[PDB]
């Protein structure tokens, strides 16, 4: 038998965490040093997440109604003899263990998308001497490096860098910032105009050659297109691997199309044909790309089938009925495959889009199109 | 806030020992879960002194009063738990589908260290009977 001991007081610091096989394998990798990390945005409100170097889990505590005693081995200091009572099926003790902890819950981990806390990060519009402007505002948070930003954000390192590339993060005049859409794409257009001006291989772009191409004939003090800006554009509109960039040409063209929508066809719904002509003419010369509205599906809207007007999904309400209400105000008739990416983020359960709608709004089709008619 | 996971000690002990095969790891550790409430005395220091050596139910170990509160007899997968003079529990050793992990949150320094992994558990799901 095993002699059973209990401490009179358990340490509640010892807690139970579910370890999936993958978590265990990662855990059983001595190579990693600081690849696993408990992370949370704040101490009192936000959730606490578990992040590997490339994956993120959300924690869920789950209470149970049983008495669970954690024990580990101890060597009893003095020989003790047990009372043999009416004990049948009970042999001489051959180990003494003492319960040192008593846990009442388990911690479930569910894989989730790590996200950046973009609370105090300002928007950059291309102002010269921006370091002065960051001190014109009272932003106490200082972001020297991305690692510091990532550390106080609910996401993994790789997730953090990816999102950072996705949001076009940079640093200007020694102050980290995020470029406005207008100035970012304008800087992109001028950059591409230099890129065609210096005949660079768009599939094998590097930072130095591109930075040199932009700032070749302009003074550096009045050249806001710094190397960090170059790194941002490369990390946003190209993919790296030294590590070199190759342009995502249909993606860049799509961005350009969204930008075109925001500049020229946002306040008015032009017929698609003329806007595509001007749009096509808006590119820097000889840029190889064709066009289709599906490339901008989810970023524009069509009051009628042959016209287009810009819409940002970010401006749509979080609540389905409200979002559908404003969507139907924007376009009386929507195509199902066209309306899906505007509501995809609200599609959490992953099921058929029509069932998702049928809780709030209701569908009505036609021949090729399947539309939704909210009341 | 944020903090890294310390798993070096468990890893070094883990690498030199085999994967957990039975209910006890090569390092000698174990968990315990009971379907019920452990009715314990409200005090502990006082009752350890009336404890006689022959009974040895409330022993003193390294200046700490440990109670010998029951006995567990492990027979293969089967396990039986006698508690005190008046309780008997019949049970089983079950292997955890998901190897859980016990770790240690050093609240003082806000440091976390992975302590151990468990693959089996000793469960008693039936109402206790007298030891007779």
């Amino acid at each position: 038998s095993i002699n059973l001991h209990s401490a009179p007081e358990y340490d509640p610091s010892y807690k139970l965490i579910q370890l999936t096989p993958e978590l265990l394998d990662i855990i059983q990798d001595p190579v990693q040093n600081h690849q696993l990390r408990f992370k949370s945005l704040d101490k009192d409100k936000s959730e606490v997440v578990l992040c590997s170097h490339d994956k993120t889990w959300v924690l869920k505590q789950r209470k149970h109604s049983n008495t669970v005693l954690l024990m580990r081995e101890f060597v009893p200091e003095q020989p003790i003899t047990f009372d043999e009572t009416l004990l049948f099926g009970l042999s001489k003790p051959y180990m003494d263990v003492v319960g040192f902890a008593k846990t009442e819950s388990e911690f479930e981990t569910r894989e989730t998308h790590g996200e950046l806390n973009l609370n105090s990060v300002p928007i950059y519009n291309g102002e010269l001497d921006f370091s002065d402007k960051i001190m014109k505002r009272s932003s106490t948070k200082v972001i020297g490096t991305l690692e510091e930003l990532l550390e106080n954000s609910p996401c993994s390192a790789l997730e953090g860098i990816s999102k950072w590339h996705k949001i076009g993060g940079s640093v200007k005049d020694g102050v980290l910032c995020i470029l406005s859409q207008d100035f970012l794409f304008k800087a992109l257009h001028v950059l591409l105009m230099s890129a065609m001006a210096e005949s660079l291989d768009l599939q094998h772009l590097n930072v130095e050659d591109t930075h040199h191409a932009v700032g070749k004939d302009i003074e550096d003090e009045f050249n806001p297109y710094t190397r960090e800006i170059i790194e941002t554009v490369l990390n946003k509109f190209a993919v790296q691997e030294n590590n070199t960039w190759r342009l995502r040409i249909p993606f860049i063209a799509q961005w350009y199309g969204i930008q075109a929508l925001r500049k020229y066809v946002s306040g008015i719904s032009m017929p698609i044909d003329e806007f595509l002509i001007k749009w096509k003419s808006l590119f820097p010369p000889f840029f190889p790309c064709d066009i289709d509205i599906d490339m901008l599906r989810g970023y524009h809207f069509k009051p009628t089938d042959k016209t287009v007007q810009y819409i940002a999904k970010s401006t749509l309400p979080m609540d389905p009925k409200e979002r559908f209400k404003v969507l139907f105000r924007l376009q009386s008739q929507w195509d199902l495959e066209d309306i899906k990416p505007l509501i995809e983020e609200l599609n959490s359960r992953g099921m058929k889009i029509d069932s998702f709608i049928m809780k709030y709004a209701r569908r009505k089709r036609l021949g090729k199109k399947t539309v939704v008619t909210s009341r | 806030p944020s903090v890294d996971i310390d798993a070096s000690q468990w890893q070094k002990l883990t690498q030199s020992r085999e994967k957990q095969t039975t209910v006890i790891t090569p390092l000698g550790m174990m968990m315990l879960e009971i379907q019920g409430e452990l009715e314990l005395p409200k005090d502990f220091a006082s009752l350890a002194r009336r404890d006689s050596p022959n009974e040895g139910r409330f022993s003193e170990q390294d200046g700490e009063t440990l109670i010998r509160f029951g006995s567990l007899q492990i027979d293969g997968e089967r396990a039986t738990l006698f508690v005190g003079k008046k309780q008997r529990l019949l049970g089983k050793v079950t292997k955890l589908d998901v190897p859980m992990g016990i770790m240690h949150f050093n609240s003082k320094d806000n440091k976390v260290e992975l302590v151990d992994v468990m693959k089996y558990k000793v469960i008693f799901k039936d109402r206790p009977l007298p030891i007779m």
Binding site: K15, S40, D42, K43, D44, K45, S46, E47, V48, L59, K60, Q61, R62, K63, H64, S65, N66, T67, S105, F107, E108 | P1, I34, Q35, G36, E37, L38, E39, L40, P41, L47, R50, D51, S52, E55, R57, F58, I67, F69, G70, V83, G84, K85, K86, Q87, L89, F105, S107, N110, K125, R127, P128
Partner: peptide
């Protein structure tokens, strides 16, 4: 030295999943 025992829970219930804060831990 004879008043130590277990009050048996007839069954097993697992509670609702809960979110965890830093303060829940600390």
């Amino acid at each position: 030295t004879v008043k130590i025992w277990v009050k048996y829970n007839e069954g097993f219930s697992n509670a609702v999943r809960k979110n965890v804060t830093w303060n829940n831990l600390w």
